[PDB]
Amino acid sequence: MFNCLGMSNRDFLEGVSGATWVDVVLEGDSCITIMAKDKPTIDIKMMETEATNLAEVRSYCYLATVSDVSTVSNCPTTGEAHNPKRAEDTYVCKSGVTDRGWGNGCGLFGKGSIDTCANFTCSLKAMGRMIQPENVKYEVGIFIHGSTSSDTHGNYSSQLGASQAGRFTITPNSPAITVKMGDYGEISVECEPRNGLNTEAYYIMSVGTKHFLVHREWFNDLALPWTSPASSNWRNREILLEFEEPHATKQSVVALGSQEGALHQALAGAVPVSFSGSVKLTSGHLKCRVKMEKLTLKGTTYGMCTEKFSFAKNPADTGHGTVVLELQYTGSDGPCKIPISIVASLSDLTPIGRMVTANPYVASSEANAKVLVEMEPPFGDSYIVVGRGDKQINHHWHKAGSSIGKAHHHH
Amino acid sequence: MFNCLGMSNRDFLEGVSGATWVDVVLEGDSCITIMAKDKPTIDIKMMETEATNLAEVRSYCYLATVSDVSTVSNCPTTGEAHNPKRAEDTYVCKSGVTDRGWGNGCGLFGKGSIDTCANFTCSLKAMGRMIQPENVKYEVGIFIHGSTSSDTHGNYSSQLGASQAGRFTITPNSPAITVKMGDYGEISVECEPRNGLNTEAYYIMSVGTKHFLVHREWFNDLALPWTSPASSNWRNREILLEFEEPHATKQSVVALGSQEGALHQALAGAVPVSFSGSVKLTSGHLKCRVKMEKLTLKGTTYGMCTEKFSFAKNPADTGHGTVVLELQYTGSDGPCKIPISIVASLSDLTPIGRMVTANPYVASSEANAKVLVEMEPPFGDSYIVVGRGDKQINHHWHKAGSSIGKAHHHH
């Protein structure tokens, strides 16, 4: 979707009289319709958020195995013990003093030395990757409620071609942007990413079959053996190793148990992510100020359409307290403004309610044009009326509800 | 090998005065010579460890492919979507709600339903098998250092026939055993398998061309799709599947990437094994207590041999600080005890050193018998002397080393 219509995850905001900005929250899967006095209605929504060229920060080991454990030992006065496995970098080595005597095969009594080494291999590891702010693009779609039909309204190519839709990019570095709006002037947008979209606060951690957005502080403080992205030999290998109390000529080295369970429990709350090479960020939101003082209706204005209309599609409930319909216009006098309104009584034509599709018009000079119109009728019974006199058509509508005030369940 | 001689992987233990047991570690490829006061010297070693009738525990999938992905979709009020592929068990199916409207071909606006299915096939799997304790035999060989020759010493048939060798089985269920020792009384042996021989701690995992001894806890916690040995349809197939965000009438289903690399890295430390139908366990060891209070020299004792000896084989270094030789006896007065000793000087015949082949004797009544003798000479110069007076033969020996104490490199 590049527009608000048809979406269930949709909100409506008002640009009230005199307001020069509207504050919005843009989620990955939602859409905002903004209606404002003497301005075209506009939709704004997040289209996509992608981050390219993730860089490794560090990898941690959460299950180690030990192998090839050996101890070199020397009786007192016979020199210090050195384990030759000290040459091989995958071995962790530990020097020690031992009590020696006749009983343990040494002629003299006193301190002997030992040097025990053991081969370190990581069984299970988790990688952390980071996102550079210069490699993040937040794609935002804008739609202007100009003339559309049921066929053209959700067609991006058609809307882009009528200068009624477009796509702009917001970045962590360039969070402000002025977007031209065809014949409607321009808007200015400034956003701040929050939660899952504030990539400065997180790393992507790959564990097992999954990838997770994880808080940087927690990842950095993980007390596990680790490797740098370059020069990969495990550091702090001693965590997960237990050098047991040594005997005179031998020493046992055992791996600690797996920390995988503790890891999974740490990741239970975290948002899973997919394909960390060009990751798609779904969670979180942008907090944006849409400045609209230069958003304007079109300088070229029209007269009213004079010929007759019919309902090409009868009013339908959108689920949002609004109704949408499609008119077909017989006249060839376009472009022209559509004489459509909502009234309480066919005997009293005072307009009530509100048009979502503000200033509806036929765009085409050709006959039989189709125009979609979305409107908010009042609570109770009303009539959608198009035209006047003996060209008038109308359709009754009933909207459930009251003005007392809606309960909400915000998430 | 059923005996210690000729092996490089050999250790010597002492049954000291008053000790009623000796504690030993039996590895798959090593041998222990035990010398003890007023007892025959004995060898003890692991002969084989085999496990029969392994049973499958579970199999895991570490690379899945998806195929025949399809979605059935329904507009609002038109009923719930059901995918008929829900009948076929190899399909994973996922129900969903979608936003519907004119734009996506539905007359009414509201929630439509979808039902997407996809065929699951495992590309690469690993099987885990378990060993019942009742199907494990640890075979242990015992040799008594009775009279032998260079020809008979390593001949099992000859040694079994002289009641100087035998083979007994230790099992996880029956880890204790009393073994008769011919005319030497008996010993009692009790063992505990450790590491690679403690089959209660492991499963055999078949991956690719290889089989590995793997820790049970790690295998059981593997978060991959799995099948029971019976009723084989994959469970937890959803791991390795990604149902992508659905469009109105379509939904993409993709397999996750292979977990083979993570698997190989998990198996890098593990001990490889061969032929898991009757697997041979090589790695690990038995920790055994050899009780020897009823081990005894033979009740039938001999006088000294009176006739002359010659060296059929000159003393040879075994590599263990011991020397082995072969005498040939001219006399027909056997069986008789051999008058052999180690001395510092031919002018002073005080015995020094130690006989590995304790109480050497000629077993045969026939002439020209050959008797192997292994002995530990002191550091420095010494003489091996056989016989007395003008029947005396001797051979000088030099042993490098000192009594200060040997450095060791235990593994």
Residue numbers in the entry:
A (entry chain A), B (entry chain A): 0 to 410
Paper excerpt:
Usutu virus (USUV) is a mosquito-born flavivirus that can infect multiple avian and mammalian species. The viral surface envelope (E) protein functions to initiate the viral infection by recognizing cellular receptors and mediating the subsequent membrane fusion, and is therefore a key virulence factor involved in the pathogenesis of USUV. Structural investigations on flavivirus E protein have revealed a strand-dominated fold with three β-barrel domains. In mature virions, E protein assembles, in a “head-to-tail” mode, into pre-fusion dimers, shedding the fusion peptide from premature exposure.
In this study, we reported the atomic crystal structure of USUV-E in its pre-fusion state. To gain insight into the structural features of USUV-E, the ecto-domain region of the protein spanning amino acids F1-A406 was first engineered to include a C-terminal 6xHis tag and then expressed in E. coli. Via crystallization screening, crystals of USUV-E that can diffract to 2.0 Å were successfully obtained via the hanging-drop vapor-diffusion method. Within the crystallographic asymmetric unit, a single USUV-E molecule was present, and clear electron densities were successfully traced for USUV-E amino acids F1-R406 as well as for four terminal His residues of the fusion tag. As expected, USUV-E also folds into three domains (DI, DII, and DIII), showing an extended and a β-dominated structure. The inter-domain angles between DI-DII and DI-DIII were calculated to be 144.4° and 153.6°, respectively. As expected, a head-to-tail USUV-E dimer which resembles previously reported flaviviral pre-fusion E-dimers could be generated via simple symmetry operations. In this dimer form, the highly hydrophobic fusion loop is readily concealed from the bulk solvent by the DIII domain of the other molecule. While the DI and DIII domains could be well aligned, an astonishing oriental difference was observed for the DII domain such that it connects to DI in a more extended manner in USUV-E and therefore leads to an obviously enlarged inter-domain angle. We therefore believe the enlarged domain-angle between DI and DII in USUV-E is an intrinsic structural feature of this viral protein.
